Amino acid sequence: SNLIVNGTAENGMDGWPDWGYPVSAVPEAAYGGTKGFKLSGGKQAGMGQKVALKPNTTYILGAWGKFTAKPGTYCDVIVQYHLKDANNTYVQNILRFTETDWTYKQVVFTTPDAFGSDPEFVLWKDDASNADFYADNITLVE
Ligand SMILES: [Ca+2]
């Protein structure tokens, strides 16, 4: 059971709030199925959704990703939340992609005993070079 809605782009951009960035669900970006997510070159771009994480629970976050040509910087896949501690610590669980062939990355993390902010998944492309980024099969599972 994937906590991310439509992590495969098989339902287009459905389940993903429009943040106004150049993110499309298109055949050229597919790792599998009929579509993948394409984050346009030339601009920073991201999308995300709130994720219903449980406390003291272990999760695996994974995704396939590639740039179409060598980028200036990177694109991150992140699950993030604040702790409910005195310092109000911000936790980012991050996969950082810079590669130009399809590359699978994953991170295993265990959630704290309480959240200080609503957990979110975020895909964020810092890079604004000419290369497009393709993301597909984005997965967050207990
Ligand atoms: Ca797909």
Task: For residue 25, give the CATH number of its domain.
Answer: 2.60.120.260
Experimental method: X-ray
Residue 109: CB partners within 8 Å, gap ≥ 6? 58, 59, 61, 79, 93
Write the DSSP symbol of residue 115.
B
10 is in an annotated binding site: yes
With contact defined as beta carbons under 8 Å apart, do 107 and 60 qualify?
Answer: yes
Ligand 1 centroid distance, CA of 6 (Å):
9
Ligand 1 centroid distance, CA of 103 (Å):
14
Domain count, the chain: 1
Q: Which domain covers residue 3, as residue numbers?
A: 1-142
35 is in an annotated binding site: yes
Ligand 1 centroid distance, CA of 1 (Å):
17
How long, in residues, is the chain? 142
DSSP 43-98: S-EEEEEE--PPTT-EEEEEEEEEESS--SS-EEEEEEEEBSSTT--EEEEEEEE-
Ligand 1 centroid distance, CA of 81 (Å):
27
Q: Which residues of 98-120 are buried (b: 16+ CB within 10 A; e: fewer)?
A: eeeeeeeeeeeeebbeebeeebe
Ligand 1 centroid distance, CA of 65 (Å):
11
For residue 27, the SS3 value is helix
Ligand 1 centroid distance, CA of 137 (Å):
6
How far apart CA 120 and CA 122 sit, in angstroms, is 6
Ligand 1 centroid distance, CA of 27 (Å):
8
130: Cα separation from own chain's centroid: 20
How far apart CA 89 and CA 82 sit, in angstroms, is 6
Q: Which amino acid, one-letter code, is at 55?
A: P
How far apart CA 75 and CA 34 sit, in angstroms, is 22
32 is in an annotated binding site: yes
How far apart CA 108 and CA 142 sit, in angstroms, is 10
